Amino acid sequence: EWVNVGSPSDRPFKQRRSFADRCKEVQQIRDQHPSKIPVIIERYKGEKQLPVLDKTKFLVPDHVNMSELVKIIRRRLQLNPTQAFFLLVNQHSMVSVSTPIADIYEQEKDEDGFLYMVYASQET
């Protein structure tokens, strides 16, 4: 009769913050930093092999390409060269995209104005 507790990090960002609150937050952030893209990065629901990230919200400069971003989130997870890691924007593996995230943002962003990314060990 154990009770399994937690965790606020296992709760999706969209359930932690209301749609209205998220829309507001994105608006302030872009005003304060027009230079940057607001990004939400979470572990895939199915994923158990990779560790969970300490943080969820990332402020990314427009010029950074997704190939560069994949490298950054990867060092942060302290992954071995051998571990498989994919960073998906709307279900596409970004470690080949050299396009600036500012261009991805206009095309792929959420209704709330955030750009949402999910990471896992397999691509599908």
Author numbering: 6 to 129
Task: Give passages from the manuscript.
All six mATG8s are essential for autophagy, are conjugated to autophagosomes and serve to recruit two broad classes of molecules: autophagy receptors and autophagy adaptors. On the other hand, autophagy adaptor proteins interact with mATG8 proteins on the convex autophagosomal membrane surface and can regulate autophagosome formation (ULK1/2 16), autophagosome transport (FYCO1 17), crosstalk with the endocytic network (TBC1D5 18) and autophagosome fusion with the lysosome (PLEKHM1 19), but are themselves not degraded by autophagy. Structural studies have shown that the side chains of the aromatic residue (Θ) within the core LIR motif are placed deep inside of a hydrophobic pocket (HP1) on the Atg8/LC3/GABARAP surface, formed between α‐helix 2 and β‐strand 2, while side chains of the hydrophobic LIR residues (Γ) occupies a second hydrophobic pocket (HP2) between β‐strand 2 and α‐helix 3 (reviewed in 3, 23, 24). To provide a molecular basis for the specificity of the PLEKHM1‐LIR interaction with the mATG8 proteins, we solved the crystal structures of PLEKHM1‐LIR in complex with the LC3A, LC3C, GABARAP and GABARAP‐L1 proteins.
To obtain the complex structures, we created chimeric proteins consisting of the mATG8 C‐terminally fused to the LIR sequence with a Gly/Ser linker. The four monomers in asymmetric unit of PLEKHM1630–638‐LC3A2–121 overlay with RMSD of 0.174 Å. Partner residues in each mATG8 protein are given W635 of PLEKHM1 interacts with E19 of LC3A with 3.5 Å distance, with D19 of LC3B and E25 in LC3C in similar way, but the bond distances are higher (6.2 Å and 4.5 Å), suggesting a weaker interaction. For LC3A, two of the four monomers in the ASU do not show this interaction and in LC3C, one of the eight monomers in the ASU do not have this interaction, suggesting that this interaction is variable in the LC3 structures. However, we observed that in all LC3 subfamily proteins, the surface to which V636 binds was stabilized by an intramolecular salt bridge, which is absent in GABARAP subfamily structure. Due to this closer proximity, R70/70/76 polar groups become more fixed in their position and organize neighbouring negatively charged carboxyl groups of the D48/48/54 via salt bridges.
